[PDB]
């Protein structure tokens, strides 16, 4: 299929109307970030020649 970007949401804009929140949600989200790699050492003489 041809992918859809997102659901369409036409915001009801007018020159004298505002939307004010009456409530709130305390939302906890996860962010995973790599920090380090495996520290690998290669003996060049032993690798090439044994």
């Amino acid at each position: 299929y041809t992918m859809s970007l997102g659901a369409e949401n036409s915001v009801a804009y007018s020159n004298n109307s505002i939307a004010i929140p009456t409530n709130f949600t305390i939302s906890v989200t996860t962010e995973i970030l790599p920090v380090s790699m495996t520290k690998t050492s290669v003996d060049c003489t032993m690798y090439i020649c044994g």
């Binding site: 004298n16 109307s17 939307a19 004010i20 929140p21 009456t22 949600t25 939302s27 920090v35 380090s36």
Partner: protein, 106 residues
């Protein structure tokens, strides 16, 4: 940068070769329409909100903080005066209460 929504705090967690941030954020919800105006015209003077916004539920005008609905009476303590009513486009007529008025009235 620290999660989706208005960032409140974050908690770090160790992970194998990594870090996991638990971002605690504030998300607005249950929004409601109100009729808004840039300024309030009272006694030939233009009043602007000191920290909030003017909202109307249909018949009465209030001032509330922008991120949560908490309507309060439009007074001189939460508004400031700058100029007359002839300049601001879309200014509406409403009364501005004075807390000092019952003190000298009594």
């Amino acid at each position: 940068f620290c999660g989706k929504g208005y960032h409140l705090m974050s908690f770090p967690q160790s992970a194998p070769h990594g870090v996991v941030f638990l971002h605690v954020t504030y998300v607005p919800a249950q929004e409601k329409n109100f009729t808004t105006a840039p300024a309030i015209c009272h006694d030939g003077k233009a009043h602007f909100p000191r920290e909030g916004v003017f909202v109307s539920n249909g018949t009465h005008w209030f001032v509330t903080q922008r991120n949560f609905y908490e309507p309060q009476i439009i007074t001189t303590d939460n508004t400031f005066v700058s100029g007359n009513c002839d300049v601001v486009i879309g200014i509406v007529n409403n009364t501005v209460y004075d807390p000092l008025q019952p003190e000298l009235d009594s």
